[PDB]
Amino acid sequence: STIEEQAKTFLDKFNHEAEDLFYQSSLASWNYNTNITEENVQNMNNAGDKWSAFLKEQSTLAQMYPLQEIQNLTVKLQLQALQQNGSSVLSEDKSKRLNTILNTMSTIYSTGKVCNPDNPQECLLLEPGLNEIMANSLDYNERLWAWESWRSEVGKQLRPLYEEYVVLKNEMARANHYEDYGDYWRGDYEVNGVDGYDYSRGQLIEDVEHTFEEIKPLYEHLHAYVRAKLMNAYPSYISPIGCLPAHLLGDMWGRFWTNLYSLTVPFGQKPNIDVTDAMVDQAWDAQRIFKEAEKFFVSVGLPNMTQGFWENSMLTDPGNVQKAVCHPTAWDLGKGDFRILMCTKVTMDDFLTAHHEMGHIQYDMAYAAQPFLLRNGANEGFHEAVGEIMSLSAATPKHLKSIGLLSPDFQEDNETEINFLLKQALTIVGTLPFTYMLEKWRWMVFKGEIPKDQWMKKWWEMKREIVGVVEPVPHDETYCDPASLFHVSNDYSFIRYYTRTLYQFQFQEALCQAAKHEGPLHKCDISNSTEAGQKLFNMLRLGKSEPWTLALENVVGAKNMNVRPLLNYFEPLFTWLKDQNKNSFVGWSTDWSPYA
Amino acid sequence: PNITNLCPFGEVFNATRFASVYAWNRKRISNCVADYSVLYNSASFSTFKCYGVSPTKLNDLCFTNVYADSFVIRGDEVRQIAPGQTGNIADYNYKLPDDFTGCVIAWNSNNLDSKVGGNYNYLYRLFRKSNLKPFERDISTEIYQAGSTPCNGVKGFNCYFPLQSYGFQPTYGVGYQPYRVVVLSFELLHAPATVCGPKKS
Numbered sequence: 192s193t194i195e196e197q198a199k200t201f202l203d204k205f206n207h208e209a210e211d212l213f214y215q216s217s218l219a220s221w222n223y224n225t226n227i228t229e230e231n232v233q234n235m236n237n238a239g240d241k242w243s244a245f246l247k248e249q250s251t252l253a254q255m256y257p258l259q260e261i262q263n264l265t266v267k268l269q270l271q272a273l274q275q276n277g278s279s280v281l282s283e284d285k286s287k288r289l290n291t292i293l294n295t296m297s298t299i300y301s302t303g304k305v306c307n308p309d310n311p312q313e314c315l316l317l318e319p320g321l322n323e324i325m326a327n328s329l330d331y332n333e334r335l336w337a338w339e340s341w342r343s344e345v346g347k348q349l350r351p352l353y354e355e356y357v358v359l360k361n362e363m364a365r366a367n368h369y370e371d372y373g374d375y376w377r378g379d380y381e382v383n384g385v386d387g388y389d390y391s392r393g394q395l396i397e398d399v400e401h402t403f404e405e406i407k408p409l410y411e412h413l414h415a416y417v418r419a420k421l422m423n424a425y426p427s428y429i430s431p432i433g434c435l436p437a438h439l440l441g442d443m444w445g446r447f448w449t450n451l452y453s454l455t456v457p458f459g460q461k462p463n464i465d466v467t468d469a470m471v472d473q474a475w476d477a478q479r480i481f482k483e484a485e486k487f488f489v490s491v492g493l494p495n496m497t498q499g500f501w502e503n504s505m506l507t508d509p510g511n512v513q514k515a516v517c518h519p520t521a522w523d524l525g526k527g528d529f530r531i532l533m534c535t536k537v538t539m540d541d542f543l544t545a546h547h548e549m550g551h552i553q554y555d556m557a558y559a560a561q562p563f564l565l566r567n568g569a570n571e572g573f574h575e576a577v578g579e580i581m582s583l584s585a586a587t588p589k590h591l592k593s594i595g596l597l598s599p600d601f602q603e604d605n606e607t608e609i610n611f612l613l614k615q616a617l618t619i620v621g622t623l624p625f626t627y628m629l630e631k632w633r634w635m636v637f638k639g640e641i642p643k644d645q646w647m648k649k650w651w652e653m654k655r656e657i658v659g660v661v662e663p664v665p666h667d668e669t670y671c672d673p674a675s676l677f678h679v680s681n682d683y684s685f686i687r688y689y690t691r692t693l694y695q696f697q698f699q700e701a702l703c704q705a706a707k708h709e710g711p712l713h714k715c716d717i718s719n720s721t722e723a724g725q726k727l728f729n730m731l732r733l734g735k736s737e738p739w740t741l742a743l744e745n746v747v748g749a750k751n752m753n754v755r756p757l758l759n760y761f762e763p764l765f766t767w768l769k770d771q772n773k774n775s776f777v778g779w780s781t782d783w784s785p786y787a
Numbered sequence: 788p789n790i791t792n793l794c795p796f797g798e799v800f801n802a803t804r805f806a807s808v809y810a811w812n813r814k815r816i817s818n819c820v821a822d823y824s825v826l827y828n829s830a831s832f833s834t835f836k837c838y839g840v841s842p843t844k845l846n847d848l849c850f851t852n853v854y855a856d857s858f859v860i861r862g863d864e865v866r867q868i869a870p871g872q873t874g875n876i877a878d879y880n881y882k883l884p885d886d887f888t889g890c891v892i893a894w895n896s897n898n899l900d901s902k903v904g905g906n907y908n909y910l911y912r913l914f915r916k917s918n919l920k921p922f923e924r925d926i927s928t929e930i931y932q933a934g935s936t937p938c939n940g941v942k943g944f945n946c947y948f949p950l951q952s953y954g955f956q957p958t959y960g961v962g963y964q965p966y967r968v969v970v971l972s973f974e975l976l977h978a979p980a981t982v983c984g985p986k987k988s
């Protein structure tokens with residue numbers, strides 16, 4: 192009997208009910224998040240568990256169609272997602288225990304409480320408190336105390352659970368005909384369709400590390416300059432040739448360096464581009480802040496906002512007695528319903544956040560016509576990068592001048608331009624090496640190349656040469672350093688925070704090439720340009736229907752993933768920083784330590 | 788002669804409730820006087836389209852009788868009602884010929900036909916062994932068969948249902964809110980023409 196045609200009717204039946212059920216779940220979640228009460232909590236669970244239990248029988252029926260004779264690529268790819276059995280491949284007890292271990296990991300991470308030694312009852316949490324201790328403060332004792340307390344009271348008590356979790360989930364991944372578990376994470380980055388566009392996991396592992404060796408000159412000079420300035424700030428605390436302690440990064444783990452700008456500003460007298468007073472002066476309330484950001488997308492050529500986005504969306508502060516969360520989110524409830532939730536304030540940071548969320552909403556609206564199983568980004572890192580593109584293009588002094596937020600006679604020049612570029616330097620190119628090292632360590636842990644004793648005696652042993660962070664105090668293996676992170680207990684893919692970065696600039700570069708605008712890449716603008724709209728719209732409308740390699744063809748000719756613009760966007764700063772460290776030796780010797 | 792015995796357009800265009808699309812509602816109107824000026828000049832109609840007779844000339848030449856076909860459909864499927872179109876409405880629920888006469892009015896009804904809890908009184912057909920012949924309604928609800936498995940009218944492995952329910956709601960975006968559609972078909976049999984417009988003094 193024919194097998195190919197009879198899957199089409201099953202898909203047509205499945206999509207209709209999936210749409211409605213997903214809409215009901217999303218509406219329940221939105222009503223809970225906007226308005227919280229003891230009655231609007233259990234109904235959300237009643238919708239969510241029904242949705243979750245609905246995905247186990249449609250998947251069950253999607254095994255009696257023998258997916259080896261299906262020839263059409265679209266139908267085969269659509270059935271590929273449904274055939275994923277999920278977490279029910281093992282016996283019931285193993286699945287229940289795995290769910291329990293995940294829940295207890297989350298709870299233990301969310302119950303962080305550590306008290307000061309002098310007052311055994313005065314505890315601070317990750318809420319405003321101990322987080323602020325090592326973020327905005329000038330003291331070496333309290334930062335060490337907080338770091339050691341956090342890394343010895345949370346993380347040392349989570350290791351025994353993670354030890355069993357890793358092996359259990361690795362066996363689960365092997366139960367789906369895969370060599371490892373990390374291959375499952377790499378699975379989203381796999382295409383096996385048209386020849387010349389195919390991809391493989393080994394090629395990913397080889398190419399994600401090859402695109403890192405080109406940025407070492409951009410990192411060594413930044414490291415040397417930061418170390419020299421911090422040594423000048425802190426006398427007799429850092430060796431002139433060694434590596435720097437972890438306490439002084441600015442965050443708990445060193446994910447971001449954005450808190451170091453005020454300490455290491457080169458042109459202190461020269462003021463930054465601040466528009467808070469100008470924004471306040473002429474009553475820049477919540478509504479027109481978003482109404483202006485709409486015009487930026489409308490001018491390029493992207494579609495105009497729907498009538499109804501201004502009605503349902505909860506744009507402003509809820510009030511006083513209507514408790515709600517304030518995480519900026521862009522909800523896509525489906526069936527033409529799009530909303531945004533964000534506690535707004537009149538700041539330029541909220542301005543950039545509004546532009547980013549508008550970009551997210553536009554991307555979500557782009558692929559609304561695809562089948563239900565294909566309404567996602569081409570991969571993990573396409574929503575976010577498209578998010579930061581607009582934020583990068585909206586902070587330009589030219590556009591701010593155009594909207595009449597700066598005095599027309601402004602005097603942007605050398606010093607302030609380098610000062611601005613330094614601020615964004617500390618954030619973007621300060622995250623790549625840590626992200627790469629953590630992902631490499633996680634993949635090595637999952638592969639099982641390392642025995643039971645080489646977990647905490649190799650993490651720092653490679654961190655010292657990939658980033659240059661020294662052991663403030665020696666420790667035995669009983670610790671567990673990476674476990675004290677947000678995306679390590681909730682089991683979230685973490686490489687999405689690396690490739691995204693590169694994608695941004697590649698797009699920007701191509702867009703700048705489709706800009707005909709003369710000048711350094713930092714000031715390249717995309718506003719007031721219809722030629723820059725169609726090139727992106729031919730890629731936003733594909734969704735997951737086409738392989739992402741072909742998606743990266745209507746914007747950039749090269750289907751590969753090469754680091755071209757990271758060595759271009761920071762083109763002047765580097766060629767200036769070569770004149771900065773004219774006397775300080777670059778590099779770091781991994782022998783000098785605080786204990787030795 | 789002053790107008791008397793006006794055709795009951797008020798019942799069709801202002802009814803209490805419209806039926807589904809797979810049992811698309813039929814009405815026969817003849818032997819009266821029609822005034823299409825109110826239909827044309829009204830600003831509440833989103834779509835008013837046809838080709839055989841221009842809207843202005845509709846008051847000039849007149850036909851034997853009219854079939855009013857009323858139903859409620861989605862937002863994007865309003866354009867689906869046209870000769871020579873393919874989909875889930877022009878193929879399996881309501882077929883229009885390639886020589887159609889008369890034409891189509893469609894307007895938004897989100898504030899009458901929608902309910903906050905989800906309106907499940909509307910269904911549409913999704914599967915059929917053979918396409919629908921022009922101007923034909925089918926109201927059977929036999930259990931569908933997909934493969935060679937003999938199903939005795941019971942759900943299971945590969946045996947399906949022909950009707951699926953809509954999910955009309957007020958919070959839906961445009962293009963998915965319910966739109967009320969009325970299609971007028973004009974007949975020109977050799978019997979005397981009955982329905983058309985007035986004279987002026």
Ligand SMILES: *[C@@H]1O[C@H](CO)[C@@H](O[C@@H]2O[C@H](CO)[C@@H](O)[C@H](O)[C@H]2NC(C)=O)[C@H](O)[C@H]1NC(C)=O
Nearest residue numbers: 195196199262263264265266267268562873874
């Ligand atoms: C896989 O099946 C889909 C659904 O039929 C195909 O999509 C249609 O393909 C035809 C030509 O083959 C086009 O005329 C239609 O416009 C496409 N869309 C629809 C909604 O019908 C798709 O081409 C098939 N892929 C193959 C055969 O490789």
Ligand SMILES: *[C@@H]1O[C@H](CO)[C@@H](O[C@@H]2O[C@H](CO)[C@@H](O)[C@H](O)[C@H]2NC(C)=O)[C@H](O)[C@H]1NC(C)=O
Nearest residue numbers: 253254255273274275276277279280281367368
């Ligand atoms: C989902 O799980 C079921 C049962 O665990 C899988 O079905 C079995 O697959 C193995 C594969 O070698 C066969 O040997 C068994 O005979 C199958 N049993 C039944 C009852 O089907 C199913 O293959 C899994 N899904 C996928 C996509 O592999």
Ligand SMILES: *[C@@H]1O[C@H](CO)[C@@H](O[C@@H]2O[C@H](CO)[C@@H](O)[C@H](O)[C@H]2NC(C)=O)[C@H](O)[C@H]1NC(C)=O
Nearest residue numbers: 486489490491590592593594595718719720721
């Ligand atoms: C290109 O940018 C200019 C500068 O903002 C835009 O011109 C402004 O248009 C508004 C009306 O939309 C006027 O109120 C301003 O006085 C104009 N300013 C200047 C300097 O001309 C122009 O609209 C933009 N072009 C496009 C296509 O969006």
Ligand SMILES: *[C@@H]1O[C@H](CO)[C@@H](O)[C@H](O)[C@H]1NC(C)=O
Nearest residue numbers: 225226227228229230231513
């Ligand atoms: C929020 O929920 C409470 C609890 O039921 C309810 O009394 C209140 O009316 C809700 N607010 C809105 C705006 O619906």
Ligand SMILES: *[C@@H]1O[C@H](CO)[C@@H](O)[C@H](O)[C@H]1NC(C)=O
Nearest residue numbers: 489493494495496497498499
């Ligand atoms: C959005 O912009 C388009 C283009 O100018 C316009 O036709 C449409 O009416 C606008 N929508 C709204 C709700 O103003």
Ligand SMILES: *[C@@H]1O[C@H](CO)[C@@H](O)[C@H](O)[C@H]1NC(C)=O
Nearest residue numbers: 458604605606607608609767
């Ligand atoms: C910026 O660099 C240019 C290039 O030499 C130089 O002429 C200018 O004086 C510099 N700006 C300063 C020093 O403020």
Ligand SMILES: *[C@@H]1O[C@H](CO)[C@@H](O)[C@H](O)[C@H]1NC(C)=O
Nearest residue numbers: 788789790791792793820988
């Ligand atoms: C038309 O008008 C005449 C006189 O003007 C009147 O007798 C007749 O009843 C009218 N026709 C109606 C009301 O249908």
Ligand SMILES: *[C@@H]1O[C@H](CO)[C@@H](O)[C@H](O)[C@H]1NC(C)=O
Nearest residue numbers: 795796797798799800801825
């Ligand atoms: C429907 O009712 C409204 C409200 O009175 C009226 O304005 C309109 O003319 C009516 N339409 C028809 C066709 O009777």
